[PDB]
């Protein structure tokens, strides 16, 4: 039982060590998508505004 | 008689499956 | 810009979130973003402020723990943390009310409550008198006295 | 054939008169700068300035060159660094070239092309071994900044002395420090005596940056049409796209996605469809092009990378995480493909080492998860180590295929990983004194030598 | 009775005429000139009218390079639409968009009848509708989206997923033995492929029953639109006046709409949401409403649309779904897994997926496969973050199967023999419907993860696994 209880905490250590990694990649890719969504939104907004200004 | 022991809650990884599977197989095979 | 410009003139605003509309707990007023000038000690008194602040703070605290639950599990969090959910679920469910003009959509005549019973009932729900009554019994009820009847109905 | 200039706004001008002016014609200002006409309205002509516009004033006289966009070509430009307009950069007197080519000429089409079966010797092991190239092919070099793209082009152009291919190097929007470092490297190694270098730096107006590749390909195809072989490289297409966005937005055209106008697929095509392998009606010459694209964040799904991929026949995507891992050049065994079959390589390559791509990509994926797989893992480290090479070490193709044969046949399993790169340098010191015949056999027959003798050669070294 | 040129803006020319001689839409104009002085250049040009802008002027779109157009030159109006040869004489030959031969093998005299390109779509009393299966032998396609004779099949993919590979595979598997007249319009593809297929057809003897016109990338914006129409005006005649079944292949018809966006900003129109011409839907409809079957014959066309990015919400490809009868979608993210073809099973559908046309044993397996794949798609986030070992036993068993199904969707094509150690293999419909049954009931599911990759019938899977030990 002592051997098993030590291996349990070892397995938990390993589980957290694998789990903590993919988070950062997922944040960096969402953040990139966030800046691209920003830039697209601003570009669309200015294009509409300048088209309206040119029309009027 | 057979004894099997597992972790007490989740996020333990593959600790739980690898023992329950093997104990189950080695008993129902024979 | 339209809500931003409108927000500057109201004396008291109540917000409605479509998430609450989909949850089936009507009305859909979100307690967090609903604020008023009346929440002052010289207008509502001290018996109002402490209970309102405690309920507001508990419902703010539950918001992030329920999101953590979505990934971390349901028993990896400590029992003391789980008690926050165990009571916030009841607190949010008891916010529902059976209205009188909704009889077409509900098929029910409703019930009536005065403000004294509201402050009183929230004090009891925080007191721990109703930990063992099911959460689903608190859906669309008025006065707190009805709840023990609905559990009697179940 | 007279008129006056009435607008000098932001490098674009409008001119009165000019009754007989034709589209695409060259124009000269009285200040001494060249310009061009792109639009002819009811009573005015739009002119794009190809130099320093700070000297132009209202009422200046402007004059007709009388011909379409012709750039001089010939053998006299060899040994010089030239401006796209046809002016030498480092002095050394005026050019003597007489013949000229319009850079807007119609590209060869149907009944003028042929398949590809012969390689373009690059000397960079990891490329020719995994992503082969042939003459007439257009291969995209695309990737992140600060990873070493230009170091590929320089090595490829130094290795071409033995194949007798006149070549052109084009620099766009680039810093003069790297330009002159490259020029000094070429003049030291002697490449300038058959290569032609054209530059258009970042301190130059946008229209020069926009026109540079057209001249770079027009001065290159001329030797093709006379039967010679030509290699052409461009330093960056992203900067040319940015310059075109600048010009279009000054011209008041409706922007599209990311403000890039819809002509992007058109502009590049009229530039990249000039490469071909001519039929017997003109000659057997061929031209290959290596354009460069820089990714803002290393994401392939952007507008310009995909639009530039749409024309080209392949791509190698240079990564940045590989750069800090101790591997150069950063070449990915995964998403990088060439559409030419394995027969383009010499028959020994396809015969023996054609499995290198599978052996390497499978390991590159399997390491992420990491007896049979335990043994498989041992080979990948050697598969990546043997492909490593340093700066200015273009290995001969015969020794290249020999070491690839040694790697692919499992001869290196005893050598420790950290010592692998030592074997590679000592091994060539062995053969020149013990296996000199195999090199000539490889050079002549284009085929693998006797298997028994090749296997017997190695045990002496081991 | 002659025209003039006063304004040039690149692809757009603003020709002018005199009172009473205004051309109609789609009319053809011709310009010829010879050098009067050494400073001039010789060019013969043809133009297509698109708009009327008053003051005795009409807008036209150039069909060739507009370099060297001196203002004040003369213009000739033919008074008729662009005319391209059609009929028996066009079999085996190759033309450009203007209709002239570009194969250099010879000329085609005026005795061959030629028709206008633009004509209105057939009336409702002339149309017909019937459903019957067209078969290709591809495992992934024939089950989840069978094709319909005389219908429209659409291919969707990014900037390189294997669209041309699928088109050439279909040609190798159907077009030669279908028994019908074949037309291949090389719209906007690479010129290398265009001149490669010419050898591929002539040296194989199939060129005697094929017609082609090319419009590849190098050509100015005016030409890239009408390649599809010049290809369709021949299949129309082959369907109607000869009573022959016709197959039509188009690779980059999307280059139609994009070309409009190039010219519209010069014609003088207001811009759309993302800068398109405000005529996308109407012009695409006027294009695809002529590819129809009738009571006299059937035209089956397989087309591919270039998606501008990994975003299907773009209006130009999104509005294509109003005409397709069978849909196939490609995405990079499945192509990168090492599975070819990377057809997405939860976005490719067809009208022919009905239980009275395919039988119970077909509809049942199709619905079962889609249902089983939906759950694995939904479990994506949680399996990615924490791992496949988190889920329960009943979910773990389901996890054991979806990837094997996806692997079984892979198959070696005939044009992949140059890249793979095996040639292309064939799996009939009766076999592709059968195959998924064994995996669904667990007859062969216990084999390892990679054995189901690049396989033909289900029997080859077991022998490949045995070869792996
Ligand atoms: N294969 C290589 N092996 C070793 N060192 C290398 C190699 N390639 C490049 N380097 C070194 O790394 C530096 C960066 O290479 P360089 O070719 O200038 O990158 P780059 O392509 O110009 N980046 P960028 O300017 O953003 O396009 C070079 O100056 C060399 O010192
Ligand atoms: N069965 C297969 N196995 C492996 N790779 C394949 C297979 N089929 C296609 N491919 C790959 O898919 C790529 C795409 O093919 P290709 O048709 O040339 O590009 P594309 O999708 O047509 N882009 P484009 O034609 O320019 O619109 C090819 O270059 C091959 O590398
Ligand atoms: Mg660089
Ligand atoms: Mg293709």
From TrEMBL, chain B:
Signal peptide (UniProt feature, chain positions): none
Subcellular location: Cell membrane
Organism: Bacillus sp. (strain PS3)
Record protein name field: ATP synthase gamma chain
Chain's role: Produces ATP from ADP in the presence of a proton gradient across the membrane. The gamma chain is believed to be important in regulating ATPase activity and the flow of protons through the CF(0) complex.
Gene: uncG
Assembly with partners or alone: F-type ATPases have 2 components, CF(1) - the catalytic core - and CF(0) - the membrane proton channel. CF(1) has five subunits: alpha(3), beta(3), gamma(1), delta(1), epsilon(1). CF(0) has three main subunits: a, b and c.
Similarity annotation: Belongs to the ATPase gamma chain family.
Automatic annotation (TrEMBL), chain C:
Function noted in UniProt: Produces ATP from ADP in the presence of a proton gradient across the membrane. The catalytic sites are hosted primarily by the beta subunits.
Residues of the full protein shown: 316 to 469 of 473
Binding positions for ADP per the UniProt entry: 26
Locations listed in the record: Cell membrane
Ranges that cross the membrane: none
Protein known as: ATP synthase subunit beta
GO molecular function: ATP binding; proton-transporting ATP synthase activity, rotational mechanism; sodium-transporting ATPase activity, rotational mechanism
Entry keyword set: ATP synthesis, ATP-binding, Cell membrane, CF(1), Hydrogen ion transport, Ion transport, Membrane, Metal-binding, Nucleotide-binding, Translocase, Transport
Any Gene Ontology CC annotation: proton-transporting ATP synthase complex
Family: Belongs to the ATPase alpha/beta chains family.
Binding residues for ATP: 37
Automatic annotation (TrEMBL), chain D:
Positions contributing to ATP 3 binding: 146, 149-151
Entry GO CC: plasma membrane; proton-transporting ATP synthase complex
Catalyzed reactions per annotation: ATP + H2O + 4 H(+)(in) = ADP + phosphate + 5 H(+)(out)
Annotated binding of ATP 6, by residue: 339
Binding residues annotated for ADP 2, in chain numbering: 339
A Pfam family it matches: ATP-synt_ab_C
Residues annotated for ADP 1 binding in this entry: 338-339
Primary site of residence: membrane
Enzyme class: translocase
Record-annotated site: Required for activity: 336
Entry binding sites for ATP 4: 310, 339
SUPFAM superfamilies given in the database record: C-terminal domain of alpha and beta subunits of F1 ATP synthase (SSF47917), N-terminal domain of alpha and beta subunits of F1 ATP synthase (SSF50615), P-loop containing nucleoside triphosphate hydrolases (SSF52540)
Record's bilayer topology term: Peripheral membrane protein
Family: Belongs to the ATPase alpha/beta chains family.
UniProt protein name: ATP synthase subunit alpha
TrEMBL record, chain E:
Swiss-Prot/TrEMBL keywords: ATP synthesis, ATP-binding, Cell membrane, CF(1), Hydrogen ion transport, Ion transport, Membrane, Metal-binding, Nucleotide-binding, Translocase, Transport
Binding sites annotated in the UniProt record for Mg(2+) 2: 164, 193
Alphabetical list of CDD domains matching this protein: ATP-synt_F1_beta_C, ATP-synt_F1_beta_N, F1-ATPase_beta_CD
Subcellular location: Cell membrane
Its membrane topology: Peripheral membrane protein
Protein name: ATP synthase subunit beta
Binding site for ATP: 157-164, 351
SUPFAM superfamilies in alphabetical order: C-terminal domain of alpha and beta subunits of F1 ATP synthase, N-terminal domain of alpha and beta subunits of F1 ATP synthase, P-loop containing nucleoside triphosphate hydrolases
Domain AAA+ ATPase: 149-334
Catalytic activity: 4 Na(+)(in) + ATP + H2O = 4 Na(+)(out) + ADP + phosphate + H(+); ATP + H2O + 4 H(+)(in) = ADP + phosphate + 5 H(+)(out)
Main location group: membrane
Residues reported to bind ADP: 160-165, 340
PANTHER family per the UniProt record, alphabetical: ATP SYNTHASE, ATP SYNTHASE SUBUNIT BETA, MITOCHONDRIAL
Stored SMART domains: AAA
Amino-acid positions noted as binding Mg(2+) 1 in the UniProt annotation, renumbered to this chain: 164
Organism listed in the record: Bacillus sp. (strain PS3)
Protein role: Produces ATP from ADP in the presence of a proton gradient across the membrane. The catalytic sites are hosted primarily by the beta subunits.
């Amino acid at each position: 039982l002592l051997d098993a209880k030590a291996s349990e905490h070892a397995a938990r250590m390993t589980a957290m060590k694998n789990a903590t990694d993919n988070a950062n990649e997922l944040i960096r890719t969402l953040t990139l998508s966030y800046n691209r969504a920003r830039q697209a939104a601003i570009t669309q907004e200015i294009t509409e505004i300048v088209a309206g200004a040119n029309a009027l | 008689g057979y004894l099997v022991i597992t972790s007490d809650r989740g996020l333990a990884g593959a600790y739980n499956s690898n023992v329950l599977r093997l104990v189950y197989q080695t008993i129902q095979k024979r | 810009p339209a809500p931003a410009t409108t927000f500057s003139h109201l004396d008291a605003t109540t917000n409605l979130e479509r998430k609450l509309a989909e949850m089936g707990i009507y009305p859909a007023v979100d307690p967090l973003a609903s604020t008023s000038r009346a929440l002052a000690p010289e207008i509502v008194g001290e018996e109002h402020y402490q209970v309102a602040r405690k309920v507001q703070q508990t419902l703010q605290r539950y918001k992030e723990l329920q999101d953590i639950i979505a990934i971390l599990g349901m028993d990896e969090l400590s029992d003391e943390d789980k008690l926050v959910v165990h009571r916030a679920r009841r607190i949010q469910f008891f916010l529902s009310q059976n209205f009188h003009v909704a009889e077409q959509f509900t098929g029910q005549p409703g019930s009536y409550v005065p403000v004294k019973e509201t402050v009183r009932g929230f004090k009891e729900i925080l007191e721990g008198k109703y930990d063992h009554l099911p959460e689903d019994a608190f859906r669309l009820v008025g006065r707190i006295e009805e709840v023990v009847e609905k559990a009697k109905a179940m | 054939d007279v008129g006056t200039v009435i607008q000098v706004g932001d490098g674009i001008a409008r001119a009165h008169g000019l009754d007989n002016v034709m589209s695409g014609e060259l124009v000269e200002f009285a200040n001494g700068v060249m310009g061009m006409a792109l639009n002819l309205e009811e009573n005015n002509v739009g002119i794009v300035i190809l130099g320093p516009y700070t000297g132009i004033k209202e009422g200046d006289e402007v004059r007709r060159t009388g011909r379409i966009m012709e750039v001089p070509v010939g053998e006299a430009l060899i040994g010089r660094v030239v401006n796209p307009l046809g002016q030498p950069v480092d002095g050394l007197g005026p050019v003597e070239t007489t013949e000229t080519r319009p850079i807007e000429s119609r590209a060869p089409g149907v009944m003028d092309r042929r398949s590809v079966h012969e390689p373009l010797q690059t000397g960079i092991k990891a490329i020719d071994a995994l992503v082969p190239i042939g003459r007439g092919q257009r291969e995209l070099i695309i990737g992140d900044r600060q990873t070493g793209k230009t170091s590929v082009a320089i090595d490829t152009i130094i290795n071409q002395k033995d194949q007798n291919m006149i070549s052109i190097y084009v620099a766009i929007g680039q810093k003069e420090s790297t330009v002159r470092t490259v020029v000094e490297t070429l003049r030291k190694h002697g490449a300038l005596d058959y290569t032609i270098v054209v530059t258009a730096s970042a301190s130059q107006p946008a229209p020069l940056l926009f026109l540079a590749p057209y001249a770079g390909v027009a001065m290159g195809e001329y030797f093709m049409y006379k039967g010679k072989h030509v290699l052409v490289v461009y330093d960056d297409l992203s900067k040319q796209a940015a310059a075109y966005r600048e010009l279009s937005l000054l011209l008041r055209r409706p922007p599209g996605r990311e403000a890039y106008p819809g002509d992007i697929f058109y502009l590049h095509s009229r530039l990249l469809e000039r490469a071909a392998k001519l039929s017997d009606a003109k000659g057997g010459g061929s031209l290959t092009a290596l354009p460069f694209v820089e990714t803002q964040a290393g994401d392939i799904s952007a507008y310009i990378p995909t639009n530039v991929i749409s024309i080209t026949d392949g791509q190698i995507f240079l990564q940045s995480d590989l750069f800090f891992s101790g591997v150069r050049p950063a070449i990915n065994a995964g998403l990088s493909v060439s559409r030419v079959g394995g027969a383009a390589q010499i028959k020994a390559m396809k015969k023996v080492a054609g499995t290198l791509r599978l052996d390497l990509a499978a390991y590159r994926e399997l390491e992420a998860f990491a007896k049979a797989t335990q043994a498989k893992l041992a080979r990948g480290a050697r598969t990546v180590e043997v492909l490593k090479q340093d700066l200015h070490q273009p290995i001969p193709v015969e020794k290249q295929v020999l070491i690839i044969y040694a790697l692919t046949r499992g001869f290196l399993d005893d050598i420790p990983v950290e010592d692998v790169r030592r074997f590679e340098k000592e091994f060539y010191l062995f053969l020149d004194q013990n296996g000199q015949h195999l090199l000539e056999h490889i050079r002549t027959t284009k085929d693998l030598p006797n298997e028994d003798d090749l296997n017997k050669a190695i045990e002496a070294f081991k | 009775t002659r025209g003039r040129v006063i304004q040039v803006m690149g692809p757009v020319v603003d020709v002018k005429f005199e009172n009473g001689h205004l051309p109609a839409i789609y009319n053809a104009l011709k310009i010829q000139h010879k050098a009067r002085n050494e400073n001039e250049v010789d060019i013969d040009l043809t133009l297509e009218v698109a708009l009327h802008l008053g003051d005795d002027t009409v807008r036209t779109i150039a069909m060739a390079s507009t370099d060297g157009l001196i203002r004040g030159m003369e213009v000739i109006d033919t008074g008729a639409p662009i005319s391209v040869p059609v009929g028996e004489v066009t079999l085996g030959r190759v033309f450009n968009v203007l209709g002239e031969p570009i194969d250099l093998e010879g000329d085609i005299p005026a005795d061959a009848r030629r028709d206008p390109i633009h004509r209105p779509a057939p009336k409702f009393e002339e149309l017909a509708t019937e459903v019957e299966i067209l078969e290709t032998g591809i495992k992934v396609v024939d089950l989840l989206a069978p094709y319909i004779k005389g219908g429209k099949i659409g291919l969707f993919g990014g900037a390189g997923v294997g669209k041309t590979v699928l088109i050439q595979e279909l040609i190798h598997n159907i077009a030669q033995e279908h028994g019908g007249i074949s037309v291949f319009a090389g719209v906007g593809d690479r010129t290398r492929e265009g001149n490669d297929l010419y050898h591929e057809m002539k040296d194989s003897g199939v060129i005697s029953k094929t017609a082609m016109v090319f419009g590849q990338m190098n050509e100015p914006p005016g030409a890239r639109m009408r390649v599809a129409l010049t290809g369709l005006t021949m299949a129309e005649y082959f369907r109607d006046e000869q009573g022959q079944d016709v197959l039509l292949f188009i690779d980059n018809i999307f280059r139609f709409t994009q070309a409009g966006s190039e010219v519209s900003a010069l014609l003088g129109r207001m811009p759309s949401a993302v800068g398109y011409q405000p005529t996308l839907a109407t012009e695409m409809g006027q294009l695809q409403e002529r590819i129809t079957s009738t009571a006299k014959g059937s035209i089956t066309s397989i087309q591919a649309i270039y998606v501008p990015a990994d975003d299907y919400t773009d209006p130009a490809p999104a509005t294509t779904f109003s005409h397709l009868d069978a849909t196939t979608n490609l995405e990079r993210k499945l192509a990168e897994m090492g599975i070819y073809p990377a057809v997405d099973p939860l976005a490719s559908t067809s009208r022919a997926l009905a239980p009275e046309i395919v039988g119970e044993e077909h509809y049942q397996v199709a619905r079962k496969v889609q249902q089983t794949l939906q759950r694995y798609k939904e479990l994506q986030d949680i399996i990615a973050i924490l791992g496949m070992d988190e889920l329960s036993d009943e979910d773990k068993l389901v996890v054991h199967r979806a990837r094997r199904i996806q692997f079984f969707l892979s198959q070696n094509f005939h044009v992949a023999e140059q890249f793979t150690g095996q040639p292309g293999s064939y799996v009939p419909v009766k076999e592709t419907v059968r195959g998924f049954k064994e995996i669904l009931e667990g007859k062969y599911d216990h084999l390892p993860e990679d054995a189901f990759r690049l396989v033909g019938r289900i029997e080859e899977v077991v022998e490949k696994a045995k070869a792996m030990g």
